[PDB]
Design a protein around this nucleic acid. Structure first.
Length: 218
RNA sequence: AUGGCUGUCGUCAGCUCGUGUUGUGAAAUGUUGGGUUAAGUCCCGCAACGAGCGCAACCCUUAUCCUUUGUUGCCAGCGGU
């Protein structure tokens, strides 16, 4: 489960004192996460996360910053699971009700789009409707086939995606976050002290998570 | 005391609501911000996501062309008048 890796921590600026148990913290004004603390934390997250993944649950990867996209689309979509990669709408969990009818409009407009009446009656309004499918497709992308509110939540940055953590704490959903030294372990049930903005680190990181999700009872 | 009908701010671009969130609360957000527009018009962003009344369009008329019918309306080409 342990591989020598490349991130070793980051974020000189705006570091958070609640990350003080997780910091080794030496070099050149920047903070180094104690990865000897990360490895048991991340193995625990794989443990409980595989435990809910084997109970046939829905996981909802969250990847708004770049380049977490399309790495969260690649990792969630490598499993049979769900994702948010563009702007996470304020309240797609806590009013999922209204977001249910927006997802319903995305389904009705893609069914109307590639099969039904798309060339019908107008060119301009048809262009309008297609770019409504671009907007509703990139905002409600992964979540469009969920049909429930999910059994866990896996966010890739705790301070950048504080809204989703705040809602999953509001609803009693287990939050699995890779925090950095600027972030805050709010209500993150399974904190992982890592590096949020390195693409090597998040592809290794989501590689491991997507690896352990796609083992159910099989 | 009223209904119905009317003027007016003003054909001004505004007025709200559901769900969510924030605030002890009155309330706030949405509706603000960068552009743009005749227009909360439209895009982008964003703890908001959407929806309604309004704006726009559908209506009448006016401006061009085609088809049909050609009286009482018209007379290009024909005949005499």
């Amino acid at each position: 489960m342990l591989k020598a890796g490349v991130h070793f921590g980051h974020q000189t600026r705006y570091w958070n004192p609640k990350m003080k148990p997780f910091i080794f913290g030496a070099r050149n004004k920047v903070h180094i996460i104690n990865l000897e603390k990360t490895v048991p934390m991340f193995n625990e997250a794989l443990a409980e996360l595989n435990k809910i993944a084997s109970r046939k649950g829905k996981i909802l990867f969250v990847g708004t910053k770049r380049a977490a996209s399309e790495a969260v689309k690649d990792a969630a979509l490598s499993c049979d699971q769900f994702f948010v990669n563009h702007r996470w709408l304020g309240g797609m969990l806590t009013n999922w009700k209204t977001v249910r009818q927006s997802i319903k409009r995305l389904k009705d407009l893609e069914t109307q789009s590639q099969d039904g009446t798309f060339d019908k009656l107008t060119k301009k309004e048809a262009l309008m409707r297609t770019r409504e499918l671009e907007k509703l497709e990139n905002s409600l992308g992964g979540i469009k086939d969920m049909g429930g509110l999910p059994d866990a939540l896996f966010v890739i940055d705790a301070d950048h995606e504080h809204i989703a953590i705040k809602e999953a704490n509001n609803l009693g959903i287990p939050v699995f976050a890779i925090v950095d030294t600027n972030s805050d372990p709010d209500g993150v049930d399974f904190v992982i002290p890592g590096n949020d903005d390195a693409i090597r680190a998040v592809t290794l990181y989501l590689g491991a998570v997507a690896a352990t999700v796609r083992e159910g009872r099989s």
